[PDB]
Design a protein around this motif. Structure first.
Motif, short mmCIF file in Angstrom:
data_model
loop_
_atom_site.label_atom_id
_atom_site.label_comp_id
_atom_site.label_asym_id
_atom_site.label_seq_id
_atom_site.Cartn_x
_atom_site.Cartn_y
_atom_site.Cartn_z
N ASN A 163 0.81 -1.22 0.00
CA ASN A 163 0.00 0.00 0.00
C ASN A 163 0.85 1.27 0.00
O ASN A 163 0.55 2.21 0.74
CB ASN A 163 -0.96 -0.01 1.18
CG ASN A 163 -2.12 0.95 1.00
OD1 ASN A 163 -2.41 1.38 -0.12
ND2 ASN A 163 -2.78 1.30 2.10
N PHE A 164 1.91 1.31 -0.81
CA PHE A 164 2.81 2.46 -0.81
C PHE A 164 2.09 3.76 -1.14
O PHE A 164 2.47 4.82 -0.64
CB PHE A 164 3.95 2.23 -1.80
CG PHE A 164 4.54 0.86 -1.73
CD1 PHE A 164 5.35 0.50 -0.67
CD2 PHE A 164 4.27 -0.08 -2.71
CE1 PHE A 164 5.89 -0.76 -0.60
CE2 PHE A 164 4.80 -1.35 -2.64
CZ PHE A 164 5.62 -1.69 -1.58
N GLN A 165 1.02 3.69 -1.95
CA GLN A 165 0.33 4.89 -2.41
C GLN A 165 -0.22 5.73 -1.26
O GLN A 165 -0.48 6.92 -1.45
CB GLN A 165 -0.79 4.51 -3.37
CG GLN A 165 -1.90 3.68 -2.74
CD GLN A 165 -3.11 4.51 -2.36
OE1 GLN A 165 -3.43 5.50 -3.01
NE2 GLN A 165 -3.79 4.11 -1.29
N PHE A 168 3.61 5.87 1.88
CA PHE A 168 4.80 6.67 1.63
C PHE A 168 4.69 8.07 2.20
O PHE A 168 5.66 8.83 2.12
CB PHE A 168 5.10 6.74 0.13
CG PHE A 168 5.96 5.62 -0.37
CD1 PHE A 168 6.58 4.75 0.51
CD2 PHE A 168 6.16 5.43 -1.73
CE1 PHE A 168 7.36 3.71 0.06
CE2 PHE A 168 6.95 4.40 -2.19
CZ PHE A 168 7.55 3.54 -1.30
#
Lengths: 810, 810
Positions: A163-165, A168
């Motif tokens: 779930n980097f979106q 991050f």
């Protein structure tokens, strides 16, 4: 080839070379905080949940392997290195790793500077302590820099890795004194945080990964370590890390000491902040002050040593074989306790994303760890029963964290209910505490529909009694102990699960493995029925057991070995009529423990066939010949290349059953040779072929049909440890718990002159000395307890907290 | 700082240094085979499904970043290097990367040896072709060896990255000639395989990762490349790879040419095997023969060039600003087409594990690519309508692969049905094809419950009408376009979705954004009603629209700007009474676009407030002041640190709406300055701050309240491209598709002397020349078509396949 040796006095394994055939790991922690640490200080830590409360970040199946962990850097006039030889990978004057019980020591020397780090989780402490000794063994004064480094995780491994979106932009840290606090999402809904602290004044720190290492640099050469000083970066999203930097001056022969703590803190929702935007650090302050000196760390280390010694003290063996002594006395029990602590959550082959353990796995581990922790075993047994359904069925997956069963996975694995009876009988035989049978356990975690535990056992028995097939054998359902024998699946779509997808009604396919299990466990069920005063129920259960035995003898024997199953078409599985899979290993062991075919010679013929067709120098294979193509009527078993996993691989879990069967037929030499082929201490000198840890059991070893024959997979998280300990300690050495006490009936190799076992059993200690004047394998001729001859082979119960001497003549 | 330049003649972006602020990537593929490739040749390929048909392995959030891809090694007398400078990271005499339309060329030279690799996916080809040129530019003959390397994936990224307990024993390969075939689970329910081939004799090969690289070595220095020879390893489980090794003689000035192919083959179930255990390679054989020479590769490259040139040929702008020319003419349309091809599946911030895209996302994307591919837009619209439910609601997540809606996520995002009307109206305006309104479209993918498309639009319109709140404003459900404004959640527990968890009924919280949507989009519905002949239905729809406008004017205006919402308690959101979040951006964008307060000055005041409170040098923030704590009544919006994502971050997606509103009020200079702050071509000289690709739009830029103010996240996959293209091409440049034709109404900065747009519209081409003699912003004075003055501002439709000259004077 060997990469180390055993230290029996200190109960350690010493790895003397950093480049093992695979990373060899160890587990720290006992109650809530757990850590996986490799021989190069790689791994990660978590709090009770490797999936939902992971603290540090680890990458599985990485290039290079085992990249990331607790990393210390020593910087000296432009040079730098690591005590564990990783991540820097520069040659060290000396390297050593010591894997102990709940602790790991790593020592490395270069350029006259030696660094020794001890990692361990103390008792009743939600943190991992790393004690570092930095010693100058040269002839000149030195100015060096010490760098610490860990990488934080965002508390959700799946979300952290997918779930980097969103994540991050969520990383948050705090820096105060010598402590770096990871508090991602602490502002919204998390009442917990982590910290990395040292007990000395620091020269600098780092909390941004891109600032400490650099975008295009690896762990082997961070830019800050190369430059010789920290950047004092405060993390804002991306990847939070924690790094201290201390400048040290050392005289020749002078050393310094440091204590690093990775800690976890939970706060009450009311007292979450000291001020607006500033977290509450009182609990962290107390935790850090608890180990602010080396003396306190040493005291905690000694207390942990005493804890593990008391855990392992209940079974002691004194024989002529040092490998057997080291296996029985230290490592088997240690692995059993670790499996109880960790279930199947996290290893180097389990990614930590799973949601729970297996019901049969939970029940079978108890057979291994019951004699060490009887009260926790009783609690676990009572928790397992509460998940059982009203009709006697069970959930396939158990979740010890929530004490619930996985509803999504479901039921219809028809061997599951019998393991509860087996584990309850084992607990009662170990403790003598029949009161567990009178406790009110709910059904499906519903307190309204609660009945006695004996009622749960009755439902488990009559679930198998009711679900019988055309030949009178139990219906296999979704699967049995062999999770890859799916006779109701018939799947042609690549992405559907073999264990949950069914296309057949399940009223034809049978299983003689479950039949043998039924005959084996019905004896214990009938004994429990007789204890409760229900004579008619015992008579009915005995009638059903006799009917099942007759069904096995009539429709379960191939002619020279026991069959395996009947498929949905009604054809035999594991028969000489088939072109592949003419013989399986699972049915023979359980049909011989049940004493089926012992008088006509069927059991001896089956065991001879097992030796003839399944034996390899590295253990027994599951079936022979291996399936060379896909059989849609068999499920996942034929989806493996030959010689791997269930396609004719070596499962040491069901090798213990063949060992028990060989003890049943009275062949102790064959049983011990079978035991030796898979025991970690006996295969150490072939470590380069085994490729895995030479001190713990693995799940599966490549079979003869494989070209990697002898190589293991899926170590440390196995039911192999419990069953092999049971086989060696109760069936071979002959010290077996029984309803009336302690039964003595060894089955040993003839050449043995004897041995002795010190056993703590029901509030007393027994010193059983077994001697073999006439070299035989089985058969007890005399037992004397406290100098007086007794009748039978059951030792009396004293419960006086004393030591009694037992002498056994064969 | 700057890391490259634009090549407008060749339609490329040239990166001149390998060490770029973040890996800058590009997409290859048009129909079924897709691949992501970075400027260092890192990335991965897949077939139609980044989740279920991934071919090569890539590690997200790695240390070092972007490790893994198509790696070529040049070995020369013990030295070795890589043309992309990665993963070896040895200094190169010259490096260059050109990102083009569907292709990427990477050139690198060292020690007099130059290597140039062109990667592209040809049309109607299930593979990626890499054409390699090795040239000797030194003064002496050389003996080199070339190594290829890719790492295979086991077709299930989640299973590949989480299920090592099984998949470490399933990897299978074959090697024949110069082709390495990956056929994991092909012996089973999979009928597809992959291959890596070269069109030349190879000196060696490798297919085992541990043999090519080594356990403790990284990509930077594989042991086989270090030794200069291959090991000829055949993969048996663990990690399969593919690697060719070719020994090359080079004279001074001599060059060699090679063609590598990564290909995917699907077989019929009856044609899977050539023989027992040997796969069928006939399709692979013809695939490899299709590009066995450089000439065929060049022909395919030219064909792909022609394909993209025809794709981008329908809108051509000729202005004085080269940045605007390259944004409109090449990169905006290219990004729109790439977003259509890829949806939201795979980027460097999307892990490729998602199951689909948003329902609103597809409709909003259609507004950008409708003029390029009108025929596929019609099919997309019909599928999206077919997924819609009977009551007018829609599934939040669309799955273009299966053409279905995600039932596990659900519905109750109350703005979702309104986007279908906008997309259908845009398609009808672009094509003039009203026949789409008369097609029988199923409801919930049920052909029995099928009605016309206009009926679907009617249900979408009346879903809002039947779901009004206490003030007459639309009842927000789980969320609106702003997915983080969850006014019905009230979540106190972590790890539970903010968008699917609702603890409140949902009959109080309303949204002013959906109200402006309803007013803006409802006029198109009224026009469609009038076209269909339903005058009474149009009258009723106009009455409802008027009531909605009155409700907005009475309960939606704060006093100097539009309110955002009413929370569940009934209090105002986005009001000057609140201490935080006193003004949002979406309501002002959509309420002015609907022309709600242009006569009383409310719209001008709202836009002035937007400029005064939300404007930054890098764009406009979502809300001000940023939330400093967690607001349980607001949802996920306050769960972000200030200045990031929805907590006062910069979304260019609503910056486009603010641009459109600024054109509505007639302020073209303000609109163009808003456009410039986010356009990639205008922010290239600040690349080191932007940190992402300087040729495509990103989803979110850090806001004024962040320490990283100006930094972007989540590039290459967003609705930003489509809406910004719409804003620049239709609202600013004034070429707007409309019912009955093409409307001319520019709103441009006063200083502009004029411009020219060549537009293909309904089977004809228009050469619209806009002139600004008196420097104004809005208002056309006369239009002459083919030399004859016309009345109005709607161009006549010809559909004769010819070119007509249009002269517009403001």
């Amino acid at each position: 080839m060997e990469f180390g040796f055993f230290d029996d006095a200190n109960k350690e394994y010493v790895i003397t070379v950093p480049r093992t055939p695979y990373p060899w790991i160890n587990y720290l922690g006992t109650e809530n905080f757990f850590s996986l640490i490799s021989n190069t200080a790689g791994g990660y830590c978590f709090y009770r949940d490797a999936r939902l409360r992971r603290i540090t970040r680890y990458r599985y199946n990485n290039v290079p392997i085992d990249m990331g962990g607790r990393y210390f850097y020593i910087y000296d006039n432009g040079d730098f290195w690591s005590p564990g030889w990783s991540p820097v990978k520069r040659e060290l004057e000396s390297y050593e790793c010591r894997h102990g019980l709940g602790y790991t020591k790593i020592a490395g020397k270069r350029n006259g500077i030696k660094a020794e780090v001890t990692f361990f989780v103390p008792l009743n402490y939600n943190g991992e302590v790393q004690k570092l000794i930095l010693k100058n063994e040269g002839q000149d004064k030195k100015k060096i820099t010490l760098f610490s480094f860990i990488e934080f995780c965002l508390w959700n491994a799946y979300d952290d890795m997918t779930n980097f979106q969103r994540n991050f932009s969520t990383g948050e840290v705090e820096i105060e004194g010598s402590v770096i606090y990871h508090k991602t999402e602490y502002r919204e809904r998390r009442n917990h945080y982590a910290f990395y602290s040292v007990n000395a004044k620091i020269s600098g720190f780092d909390s941004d990964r891109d600032s400490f290492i650099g975008l295009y640099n690896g762990f082997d050469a961070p830019q800050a370590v190369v430059n010789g000083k920290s950047n004092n970066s405060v993390a804002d999203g991306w990847a939070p890390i924690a790094s201290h930097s201390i400048e040290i001056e050392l005289n020749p022969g002078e050393q310094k000491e440091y204590v690093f703590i990775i800690g976890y803190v939970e706060n009450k929702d009311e007292e979450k902040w000291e001020s607006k935007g500033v977290i509450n650090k009182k609990k962290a302050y107390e935790m850090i002050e608890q180990f602010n000196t080396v003396e306190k760390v040493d005291k905690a280390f000694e207390e942990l040593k005493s804890y593990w010694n008391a855990l392992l003290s209940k079974y002691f063996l004194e024989s002529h074989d040092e490998k057997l002594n080291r296996m029985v006395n230290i490592w088997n029990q240690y692995q059993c306790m670790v499996t109880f602590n960790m279930s199947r959550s996290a290893s180097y082959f389990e990614s930590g994303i799973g949601r729970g353990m297996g019901f049969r796995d939970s029940n079978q581990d108890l057979l291994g760890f019951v004699h060490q922790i009887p009260e926790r075993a009783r609690e676990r047994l009572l928790d397992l029963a509460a998940t059982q359904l009203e009709d006697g069925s069970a959930y396939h997956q158990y979740q010890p964290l929530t004490k619930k069963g996985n509803n999504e996975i479901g039921s219809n694995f028809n061997d599951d209910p019998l393991w509860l009876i087996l584990a309850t009988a084992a607990y009662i035989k170990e403790t003598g505490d029949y009161s567990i049978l009178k406790e009110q356990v709910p059904f499906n975690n519903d307190p309204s529909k609660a009945d006695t535990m004996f009622e749960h056992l009755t439902r488990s028995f009559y679930h198998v009694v009711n679900n019988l097939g055309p030949h009178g054998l139990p219906l296999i359902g979704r699967a049995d102990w062999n999770d890859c024998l799916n006779l109701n699946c018939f799947s042609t779509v690549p992405d559907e699960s073999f264990q949950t997808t069914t296309s057949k009604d399940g009223k034809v396919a049978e299983s003689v493995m479950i039949a043998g299990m039924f005959v084996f466990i019905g004896k214990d069920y009938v004994k429990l029925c007789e204890y409760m005063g229900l004579e008619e129920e015992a008579r009915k259960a005995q009638q059903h057991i006799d009917a099942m035995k007759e069904a096995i003898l009539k429709y379960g024997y191939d002619g020279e070995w026991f069959l395996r199953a009947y498929d949905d078409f009604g054809r035999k599985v594991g028969s000489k009529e088939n072109e592949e899979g003419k013989i399986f290993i699972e049915s023979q062991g359980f049909c011989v423990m049940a004493e089926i075919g012992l008088e006509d010679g069927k059991a001896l013929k089956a065991l001879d066939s097992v030796k003839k067709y399944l034996d390899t120098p590295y253990g027994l294979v599951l079936q022979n010949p291996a399936f060379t193509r896909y059989y849609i009527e068999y499920g996942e078993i034929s989806t493996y290349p030959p010689g791997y996993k269930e396609n004719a691989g070596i499962f040491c879990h069901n090798n213990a059953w063949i060992i028990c069967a060989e003890t049943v037929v009275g062949r102790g030499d064959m049983a011990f040779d079978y035991y030796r082929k898979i025991a970690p201490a006996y295969i150490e000198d072939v470590s380069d072929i085994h490729k895995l840890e030479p001190y713990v059991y693995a799940q599966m070893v490549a079979g003869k049909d494989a070209k990697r024959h002898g190589e293991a997979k899926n170590s440390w998280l196995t039911g192999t440890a419990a069953w092999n300990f049971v086989a060696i300690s109760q069936w071979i050495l002959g010290v077996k718990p029984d309803y009336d006490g302690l039964k003595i009936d060894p089955c040993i190799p003839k050449a043995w002159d004897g041995y002795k076992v010190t056993r703590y059993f029901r509030g007393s200690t027994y010193e059983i000395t077994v001697k073999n004047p006439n070299h035989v394998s089985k058969g007890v001729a005399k037992i004397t307890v406290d100098g007086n001859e007794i009748s039978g082979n059951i030792l009396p119960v004293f419960n006086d907290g004393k030591t009694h001497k037992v002498e056994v003549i064969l």
